[PDB]
Symmetry: C6
Subunit: 247 residues, 6 copies
């Protein structure tokens, strides 16, 4: 248990492979986040600010949300994660979630990350089915101002903005930030360079196949394809990589 | 615990940014509310009066309901809010809600605000799903006259009048008051002036873009767009504001 | 707790604004009710008699049912009302309802009013949803003869005859009595006169606008429109009344 | 608690207005019932026999089932009625129902009446909804032979043969007996005569209006219409009767 | 409680009217069953063998399954029947069912009959509705090999092969055996002869009406029609029989 | 209970009839599995690797998953199987499943097999119905990295890749490996040879009927058809085999 009104998060587990600048959108996400941190800390009109980072799966939403939170330097920073509520009933999740906000309210400046909203709400498109009790708790928490004078920045992440819109959750968030997949051959080459896994000859081959072209892959997904490619004999790593990227 | 048959609400949390007269509808809402307060206090025929303030999200329904209640000067004034029932089961909400009315009945003149009906009922359009037990309790409470001779003004708020109509709740309310978003450039300029955030040169620029035109934004939403605009460098505040207002 | 096999109801709360003879249907309802009371008390063939008073909302069903019951002069008269089962689970309602009939069976002559069937059954058209356990208990209670020799008149009220028909409840009731809204300008003028709220000049103005015409408003609703009209300056009371009546 | 393996039912409550021979179908129902009683008592091949008496509501199903049971003269005769399970959960009903059969199995010759199957199963056409646990218990009980050598006649009644067919319950019953409403003016006149409520002049008038014609009314329903007619002044009893019969 | 790893079933209750050879399919069912018993006892590759006996209702599935089991002469033979789980919750059924298999696993050679799968699963076509917990337990039990070296023959019965297929249960059974209704006049005459209920003159009459023709009736159903026919006066037994067989 | 951070599985029960090389796909499955084991043990970027083995029912998914796990030689190897959760409620399954991963996290190198996902999730296509609580727990567990520095290979198996895709589970798995049924006469002949059940003359006959042709049968299913064929008289084994294979 941390000091009263404080909390230091373990960003290592949420950003295990860093934050590489593979393209302009990465900088845009971080800059927009810092502006929201600025607004939260300095505003009396809007002491409660919430933002939803959303994009396709594996695009890097969680790590970016954790980075924005980390850069806020707020006394209280906590990440509400589903991997800490495995098997939890609706009530159990609401109590756990409510506890986090209760502790946040004790700090003058706090930031709470509500990560992977779809999992927190136990959503599944078949039906669909989901925990309405948890959804309702979240809709209220997103609009509950901390006690007078104290500020709170809520950062949510999701790969299903569409579902959250149907649930009326978008009306609860102050704004949203799109977290895109790598979309161009250039951005893809930049990522590979910053990650440094292939030799120039290999990157050249890849480049010939992707430069000036369009791709669609999340940074987290790219990490896996690379690692799978590296298990091949040196002479087949590139072939494997392009094949995986292809299908 | 307050004195028997009494209760003083903390209006500061429900009206954190005041009540500015950005347009005629604001005065209309307050005046209609005072007439209902008058009817409640003076009538023997209709000792129970209920009104639903409804309009688009962020239009200022809660603050206006809290203001009408505050201006009643009734001995007992209580706001039934969902942010005090987070994670609550249907039964728990009904008991909490029933307690409030029970205490209200102890006063000769009382006013109860049932705020954000959609959240109180755990409503979600997917399904849809909602707490019928809570809906039923509310339908009965809306028609239950306080013990003989005592008066009660019930003020509800909602951003989903359509849903409440389907639930037959409109037949329970005595009347309804529409709470509109700011709808004209003039009303928008008036709001900015009363809030005093931009310089004349800036308001002039904005005016050139909105005067004699139509807009659609809730006062609560406007506060957020302004505050977000203020984080920009002086030379780009207006550009940001119009862009946000645009999309 | 009342004397064994007895119960005196508090008709004041169910008939707070009397029973005015605004039109022939009021007399028809009371007369049909007295005939059913007569049949119940005098018949050996049909010792159990049930009747459903139904009509549009606010038409005066409850007060009329309470009046019919009151005029029976039976030793045991009890009104089963939803405002005494707020927040109740299905089981809780069935037990409460079953208790009332159990006590009624102890009297030689009893009358039980099952008021606002839709609320007792927790009905909502979305779904729809309702308490089947309560519906089933009611279907059985409506056909359960008191112990040999004893009589029971069951009077139900509802604003949703259509729903009850779908639920097969109409096959349970012995007969039904329609409780209509005020339907003609004449009946409307008669009501205003018997209630005595407007001056002759005013009633004359209203008459010019409604006499020889058709209207559709429940007596309970009319009381509210009048009371709202009375909050206006003398010179605008009539204008307000007709406007409210209009929309 | 009755003697081991025995049970005497109170037929008075299930046949409060006797069994009048208003038409051939009444005799047909009783005769078919006695044949099934005969088969049950004398057969080694089919020691378990079940029959469903079904027809429109109010046609006299329960009283006829109770009469067939009474005429069996079996040591154990028990009527499983829903008015003894008001408010019961599915489990509670199954236990109560299972208890009855358990006691029946203790007798060499037993007869169990499962009355008003729709109510026992908590059926409602909206949905529809019903207690599947109770349905399943009944489907199994209908096919469970008493312990070797002992006989059991199960008599069910229902006004919804169609619903029971959908539930596959008809495959469980050995056979079914139709219990029709009074269908001809002759049968109607015979009923009135056997009940002796109108004077010859009156029956003559009625006859002129119904003889050689077709009608459709259950004996239980007829009893109520007559009794309602008898509340009128002598000169209007017939008019009332035909009017009620008409609509 | 029987000896460890053993269990002797009471086949009398499951085969109360024997196993008559009314036609070739009866022999086919028994022969196929003995081959499966042979495979189970002798195979190391498939120590777990399951078979579903299925056909129309009343065709004799249970008695035939009980006969196949009886003829296996296995040390452990147990019939899992729904008439021993009346009113049972899903969990209760799974525990009871799991207990049986647990005991079977203790024997070197065991046979478990899972009778009337539709009832075990609380199936009803309206909805439909059924116990998924029980279905899941059965799907797993059908594929769980007894502890190494021990054998188990599972025999299921059902009148709804179609439903079980939709539930994916057919992929769980090793094979299926069809249990048909009596289908020809010849088979029908053979049954009557083996049961010996009618006189030659009578069988001759029946023969004239059914020989060289097609019929469709389950042996269990035939037993009931015969027994019902025998309640008639000698001169009308045949007439009754053909009438019943007709409709 | 095994040593801290360790666990040795009993592969005998999951691979009771070995792993025969009936065709190239068998080698492909094992080779792809070893590459994933290699990646898991050697990578710092992707310390958590998950793979779904999927294909038609009876194709050999479980045994192959168990073989891949066995060949990893990891200190901790555990198979999460539904036959150890029979009758389990959603919560019970989640706790049991969560326990396994918790123990796995204690090892530097672990492999967890989540076998037969459809059964673990209590899936049934009618509805459909399934345990969402279990699905949600699995979606989170599939993405939860073991504590820093430790590796985990998760291997799932399913016969319903389509259902898992709808449930969004495919986005959770790192990759998938298809486990096909035997598809050619050649592969079928190879299987029979490796299993050694028929004589050359017999295999020759079969070959004449299947060589250069296409078939579709899972290895587990083939084992059963063979064993059933072996119960026939020597002269009819082949006839039986082809007949079974045919339909
Ligand atoms: N610019 C970047 N933005 C985000 N993540 C990055 C970046 N550069 C490297 N990474 C690494 O990529 C991974 C991103 O995975 P993360 O779990 O954040 O994705 P996600 O979109 O939240 O996934 P999911 O859709 O599964 O929720 C982390 O290992 C992170 O350190
Ligand atoms: N004229 C006004 N009417 C209402 N609110 C006003 C007005 N002028 C300023 N405000 C401020 O705007 C905010 C209105 O937000 P409020 O929560 O009342 O809106 P709402 O419509 O109830 O929101 P929601 O749709 O989220 O329920 C408060 O901060 C309030 O003080
Ligand atoms: N003739 C009348 N019949 C009925 N009520 C009357 C009559 N004259 C005056 N009233 C008054 O009108 C009101 C009728 O309201 P009541 O609650 O009975 O209506 P309702 O139709 O039962 O309402 P709801 O639809 O809300 O259930 C009572 O205050 C009653 O005293
Ligand atoms: N021939 C008859 N058959 C049946 N009931 C008769 C007959 N003659 C008179 N009665 C009387 O009519 C009434 C029949 O009502 P009963 O409750 O048996 O009908 P039901 O069809 O079971 O009703 P429900 O549809 O409500 O279940 C009883 O009072 C019974 O004594
Ligand atoms: N050849 C036969 N096969 C099966 N049952 C026979 C045969 N000959 C006589 N019988 C008798 O017929 C009856 C068959 O009924 P059983 O309960 O087995 O049928 P079922 O198809 O299982 O019924 P249900 O569809 O109700 O489950 C038993 O009394 C049995 O002894
Ligand atoms: N090459 C092989 N691959 C897989 N199983 C094999 C192979 N050769 C022989 N077998 C044997 O075939 C059986 C395969 O059955 P298994 O339970 O693994 O199949 P499955 O596809 O998982 O079944 P289900 O669809 O029922 O889940 C085992 O007995 C296994 O030892
Ligand atoms: Mg994420
Ligand atoms: Mg509000
Ligand atoms: Mg009423
Ligand atoms: Mg009946
Ligand atoms: Mg059977
Ligand atoms: Mg498997």
């Amino acid at each position: 248990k941390p000091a009263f009104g404080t909390n230091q998060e373990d960003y290592a587990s949420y950003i295990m492979n860093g934050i590489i600048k593979w393209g302009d959108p990465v900088t845009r996400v971080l800059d927009d986040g810092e502006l929201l941190v600025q607004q939260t800390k300095n505003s009396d009109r809007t002491p409660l600010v919430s933002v939803l980072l959303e994009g396709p799966p594996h695009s890097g939403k969680t790590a970016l949300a954790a980075k924005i939170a980390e850069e806020s330097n707020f006394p209280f920073i906590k990440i509400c994660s589903p991997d800490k509520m495995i098997g939890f009933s609706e009530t159990a999740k609401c109590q756990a979630m409510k506890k986090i906000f209760d502790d946040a309210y004790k700090s003058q400046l706090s930031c709470v990350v509500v990560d992977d909203i779809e999992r927190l709400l136990d959503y599944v498109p078949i039906g669909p089915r989901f925990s309405n009790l948890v959804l309702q708790a979240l809709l209220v928490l997103l609009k509950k101002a901390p006690p007078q004078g104290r500020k709170l920045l809520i950062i949510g992440t999701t790969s299903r903005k569409d579902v959250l819109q149907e649930m009326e959750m978008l009306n609860a968030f102050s704004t949203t930030i799109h977290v895109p997949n790598i979309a161009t051959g250039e951005q893809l080459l930049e990522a590979l360079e910053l990650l440094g896994n292939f030799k120039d000859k290999e990157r050249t081959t890849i480049a010939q196949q992707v430069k000036g072209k369009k791709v669609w892959i999340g940074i987290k997904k790219l990490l896996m394809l690379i690692e799978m490619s590296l298990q091949m004999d040196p002479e087949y790593r590139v072939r494997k990589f392009l094949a995986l990227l292809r299908e």
